[PDB]
Design a protein around this ligand. Structure first.
Ligand SMILES: NC(=O)c1ccc[n+]([C@@H]2O[C@H](COP(=O)([O-])OP(=O)(O)OC[C@H]3O[C@@H](n4cnc5c(N)ncnc54)[C@H](O)[C@@H]3O)[C@@H](O)[C@H]2O)c1
Ligand SMILES: NC(=O)c1ccc[n+]([C@@H]2O[C@H](COP(=O)([O-])OP(=O)(O)OC[C@H]3O[C@@H](n4cnc5c(N)ncnc54)[C@H](O)[C@@H]3O)[C@@H](O)[C@H]2O)c1
Ligand SMILES: NC(=O)c1ccc[n+]([C@@H]2O[C@H](COP(=O)([O-])OP(=O)(O)OC[C@H]3O[C@@H](n4cnc5c(N)ncnc54)[C@H](O)[C@@H]3O)[C@@H](O)[C@H]2O)c1
Ligand SMILES: NC(=O)c1ccc[n+]([C@@H]2O[C@H](COP(=O)([O-])OP(=O)(O)OC[C@H]3O[C@@H](n4cnc5c(N)ncnc54)[C@H](O)[C@@H]3O)[C@@H](O)[C@H]2O)c1
Ligand SMILES: CCCCCCCCCCCCCCCC(=O)SCCNC(C)=O
Ligand SMILES: CCCCCCCCCCCCCCCC(=O)SCCNC(C)=O
Lengths: 268, 268, 268, 268
């Protein structure tokens, strides 16, 4: 038993055991929830990884860009959980953006073909996923997607910041749409965690200039954060997503709950 | 056992069983926390009311405006809980403002002697209380005070809005101050609940004009709210304060967690 | 002479004499600025309309979605103004969204092909335009695009809100990009103005089901607005865009200046 | 010509040629605005200070913490300008707060007295000069006092950022109980210019701690602004205030006009 006792919670976005999505699943499982895991394309590969999760959770295939995947979604999920049973949650830990609009390549240069590829998988997909799953959700259910404070412009995040900013706005509209089924829609704003990707830029893969600009940024995050910030530990972020998936915040919708050590409230 | 199992949580602001503070205590108690209740002046009276709380919690006297009360605070509390034991939380459900700056009397007329009386008990007291108690708080502890979205100017709330706006800012500074002890500082923003006071204005005690301006406001709160808003039930607000008092949001500080049905994110 | 004396200011987005862009041009011209007008496709038609502008301003063709148009942009403009002379401003009054995005279309239905068509012309084009023109701008120059407060979710705007929200974020990044040339980037947030089919969004073609929606919106806007709101007059918005184009706000960048009667600051 | 050639304005708050006001005033006094100034506890001081200014304007011994003073804050200016000849501007730059809630003296090391005592000029104040000068004001005309971004918790500024979150909230209600007057009350928030308060809170009377902290935040703002920021001068910031008096920013209220240099909007 536990925080997520008896709840059937869906969790997408696991590609490795460093994924925030992997930690959300691990913690969600410990807390008692029953998971239905979805994976992009490396099905036999990420399968192996989902084997690390304390409990077995049926892996289903889901490319958010494909309406064939979306359509089948609710359907498979039902077979995944059972007939009669419905979903208590949906976790959208999906975020993409080709190097063209994120990082060392300039802001003005990133072409729309890529920007749009990020805005479709990062921002929009939240909607289409709320769209495909909402019907099979019990009232009182919760849908929570990841965010990264787009309020102020920062170097490198460039177009991925813009796609996240669009994400928050979408959150609000899905919120009233989810309202009709009793579901809540919320977004979590974490500080940088070191997934494969971040370890990459850190160690000069991007190079000197970049690896530093981001180093200091991660560095400063700890400066301002009152209870500090531990970028090599996602457990604080997993815990937060689980709380939002519980009966303890039954009134927050179209909202954003920050889990970045409060770094965003301090200036220095 | 439960959400607040084994935690010793302080809860001030109970004057009746309609007080949000009363609900925070009732739920906190059910969830397993051990309470230490503080009361303003009607000690023998509010005592009788705290008797309704599922469990007995030692009532201590606390007038936030009195430095004698503040100084003794930590002290008594220790006797209240025991030698060795420390506090896991502090709940500041205190808010005051003489009718001069709130309601039907105009904004320009409210004199500073009153405005200041509200700003001392509503805004500042959060600090002095964090001041008096912080020392006896275990790291990982949480301090949460009530708020009422001051972002946009609304009729009647007038100077009490201003004092709450000052409150949020104080929250941020106490946040970094609490950081050094491992405590988190957060503010909850609820929509209108009907305590004694609100039932009063509603039923024309203030009169026609006022009783209506507030009626429609409470009315519209439900309009915009996606999962609606039940002003005759504080259970949703109590639940939220308890979650903030738990291990499930270990990274939010100097923050504000809205519990108003998300009415604040929608325009219509 | 006047507010925009001697300044060569570009103004895009004029399709009729109801366009806010038309008013920005009329006032800009009165104030002394020299205009370089751009039109989408109805070149012979909107040409006829630009003839109403107090003074003649060379019409150039510009489809923002076409990199051929963009590339040629700086070039033509130079021939339009002269050799040696540079631009002092750029006004991006461009905004698009097919009825499946906005409309009364259930938000979940709007497919990405359209959403993306709006996000390319509304949000992104701001960038590519700042991209194409920045080079020929004098330091101290100003680029200002239109906005419509996306902070809170409102009915009908749906995906166009999302595109506008993306727009503000882009503004911030163009802001630091423009910084290097001395140019400022800012967005103006107006309340509803009535433009010919926008009179078919209320008491015309689009106000029968969720059509009164833009009534109580067009209505409520005046309620909350302290100095009121006159939706049948764009002069207040034109005046604001000209001030931003002047030497009187030399330090605001990546910012948003609201021109909706302050309706956005009041709750009721 | 001028923005203000012909506009009648009271500019409140001159102590030095180096403090904000002496700036707004020469700039305002040069733009055709005929002004009437206010001074504090050494008017014999602000007197010969003022000769340094561009033309003549009388000095009224005020102090918005004195009520016989507030009492007469209309029919003394009405005596100062014309025999029933009206007034256009209220450029409030009245603000102050004692060194215990300052930086040097720690957040918790201070009491109410002093905070309450500073708000009176800092926060509350704007909600004073308002009522007084109001029915002696002409439509159009504005009420505008300085703001220093309260949003993030600026350590070292402490209570005079909290008072700042409060000046703001109070300027929004004056945005309504003035909007009937067709008057504007709008806040111009700007960055830490080197004035006698700051120029001295470094060179000698505070030794360090708030100091390193302040220079800590000055290297910042500069390094963080797209169009950059200088602090050895206030002129672009003084200008941004002016057009906020003119007819060029016509549709805003209970608003914040930012001339900080785009520093409030840049993460890194
Ligand atoms: N790591 C950080 O610093 C950090 C911090 C806060 C928030 N975030 C955000 O959280 C999200 C997850 O990133 P992460 O680093 O925690 O984990 P991750 O990158 O390991 O997980 C992201 C997932 O995106 C998915 N994806 C991409 N395109 C897809 C598509 N077409 N269809 C279906 N799935 C697709 C992949 O399956 C992948 O598992 C992103 O939105 C990211 O911006 C990251
Ligand atoms: N009721 C609502 O509509 C509503 C909604 C959201 C937030 N709030 C806020 O929550 C807080 C509590 O109000 P409520 O209606 O839930 O309950 P309440 O009014 O019943 O409780 C408020 C408490 O203020 C305390 N108090 C006043 N001065 C004091 C002082 N000098 N020293 C010590 N204690 C003092 C009293 O002891 C009283 O118990 C206020 O800040 C209020 O603005 C109210
Ligand atoms: N009317 C209102 O209620 C209102 C209020 C505030 C802000 N706004 C915003 O201001 C902008 C202008 O709308 P409006 O009603 O004032 O005027 P409008 O609709 O008359 O002008 C908009 C322009 O969009 C242009 N456009 C579309 N696609 C283009 C493309 N592919 N390439 C180049 N140009 C293209 C057209 O040329 C057209 O002139 C929009 O962003 C709108 O959302 C509208
Ligand atoms: N310099 C900075 O750090 C900076 C920069 C931007 C914004 N802010 C804010 O800008 C505003 C302008 O400050 P300045 O830097 O020109 O300061 P200054 O102190 O040199 O001049 C402004 C005035 O503060 C006044 N003041 C104190 N009590 C007052 C009272 N009771 N009556 C009348 N005036 C009162 C004095 O009369 C003094 O003349 C302040 O409110 C400041 O908080 C500060
Ligand atoms: C190769 C990764 C690109 C480098 C990181 C992008 C620029 C970093 C600066 C902004 C910091 C923002 C924190 C966000 C980090 C991310 O979104 S990681 C990308 C998500 N998933 C992967 C592995 O691609
Ligand atoms: C007698 C109460 C005064 C009337 C209510 C104030 C004006 C209501 C309009 C704004 C609505 C805001 C909701 C907030 C309500 C409160 O803070 S109730 C006062 C707190 N405690 C008491 C009983 O005095």
């Amino acid at each position: 038993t536990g925080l997520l006792d008896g709840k059937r919670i869906l969790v997408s976005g696991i590609i490795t055991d460093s994924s925030i999505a992997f930690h959300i699943a691990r913690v969600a499982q410990e807390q008692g929830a029953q998971l239905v895991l979805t994976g992009f394309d490396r099905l036999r590969l990420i399968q192996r990884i989902t084997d690390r999760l304390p409990a077995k959770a049926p892996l289903l295939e889901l490319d958010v860009q494909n309406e064939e995947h979306l359509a089948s979604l609710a359907g498979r999920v039902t077979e995944a959980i059972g007939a009669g049973n419905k979903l208590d949650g949906v976790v959208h830990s999906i975020g993409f953006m080709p190097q063209t609009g994120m990082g060392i390549n300039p802001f003005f240069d990133a072409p729309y073909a890529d920007v749009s590829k990020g805005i479709h998988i990062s921002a929009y997909s939240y909607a289409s996923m709320a769209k495909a799953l909402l019907p099979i959700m019990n009232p009182g259910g919760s849908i929570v997607g990841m965010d990264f404070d787009p309020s102020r412009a920062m170097p490198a995040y460039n177009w991925m910041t813009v796609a996240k900013s669009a994400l928050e706005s979408v959150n609000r509209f899905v919120a009233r749409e989810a309202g009709k089924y009793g579901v809540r829609s919320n977004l979590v704003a974490a500080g940088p965690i070191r997934t494969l990707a971040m370890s990459a830029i850190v160690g000069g893969a991007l190079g000197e200039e970049a690896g530093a600009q981001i180093q200091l940024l991660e560095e400063g995050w700890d400066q301002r954060a009152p209870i500090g910030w531990n970028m090599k530990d996602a457990t604080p972020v997993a815990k937060t997503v689980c709380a939002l998936l519980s009966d303890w915040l039954p009134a927050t919708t179209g909202d954003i709950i920050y889990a970045d050590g409060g770094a965003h409230t301090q200036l220095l």
